[PDB]
Amino acid sequence: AKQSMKAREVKRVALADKYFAKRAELKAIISDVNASDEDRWNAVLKLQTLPRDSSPSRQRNRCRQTGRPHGFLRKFGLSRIKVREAAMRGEIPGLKKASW
């Protein structure tokens, strides 16, 4: 839960949610073979000097409440230690200890 690391992660979202269209169209163009070599090279050179830390696959999924950089779960958006205390208190509509 470091304050220094808690701002870079939100920057990596507030900047990656803005370049969605340009990056999508560039990926489509450079992925479709029906293009021109000079245009593709210019596009990739323009893409690479875009801010580095704004890439979608350049941020580790950080926990919501405590920001633990390991064990992040898609279902709850929380780490194991916090989902334990959440499901134990009973705030998760349906989380009961189980037995198959």
């Binding site: 409440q65 898609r74 709850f76 958006g77 349906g94 200890k97």
Partner: protein, 212 residues
């Protein structure tokens, strides 16, 4: 660190939940954070009125917060407008339209939090810790309860060594899966440090489980 948390095992038998709306793997982290924020704001806004439980619901993109307290006079205020005034701020916090409900408890000394409260207050105002403990025990026993186990950890009576002490009157089962075990925990802040207060309350045998 030895006993299992009783609420997490009594969730699916008798004890109701505190959040049971419907989300799909996308907004529950946000819903959980909103619930935590509204609860922590409610605690700070009603630190004087004895408040025990807060339940949340989300029917059709709208948030409902139900508070179970014993002093609704402070929260209601004169002319019955402070409830709406704070509903405004909780709606602002939650974003989606909000509504609140009050479930004032008659004779609430059997509530875990409200029976673990005001003893923290006596310890803060330096009333004798043994007097506070025996008063809490007698107050929890006089209302017809069948057993209260409250655990006190850390500097009993503003001491200098974090010790472990616990009283037990009546019977307080922990392995029976039909016994209503109301459990909670609170903390007391004093000039010498912090003290922990954990309370289990055995209501009695409840057969049939849910659906009354």
């Amino acid at each position: 660190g030895q006993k299992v948390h009783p609420n997490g095992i009594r969730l699916g038998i008798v004890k109701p939940w505190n959040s049971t709306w419907f989300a799909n793997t996308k907004e529950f982290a946000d819903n959980l954070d909103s619930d935590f924020k509204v609860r922590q704001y409610l605690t700070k806004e009603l630190a004087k009125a004895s408040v025990s439980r807060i339940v949340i619901e989300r029917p059709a993109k709208s948030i409902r917060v139900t508070i179970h307290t014993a002093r609704p006079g402070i929260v209601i205020g004169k002319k019955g407008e402070d409830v709406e005034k704070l509903r405004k701020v909780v709606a602002d916090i939650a974003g989606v339209p909000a509504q609140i409900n009050i479930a004032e408890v008659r004779k609430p000394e059997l509530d875990a939090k409200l029976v673990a409260d005001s003893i923290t207050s006596q310890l803060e105002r330096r009333v004798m810790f043994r007097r506070a403990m025996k008063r809490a025990v007698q107050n929890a026993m006089r209302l017809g309860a069948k057993g209260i186990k409250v655990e006190v950890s850390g500097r009993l009576g503003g001491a200098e060594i974090a010790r472990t002490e616990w009283y037990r009157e009546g019977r307080v089962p922990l392995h029976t899966l039909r016994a209503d075990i109301d459990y909670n925990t609170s903390e007391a802040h004093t000039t010498y440090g912090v003290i922990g207060v954990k309370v289990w309350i055995f209501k009695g045998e409840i057969l049939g489980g849910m659906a009354a």
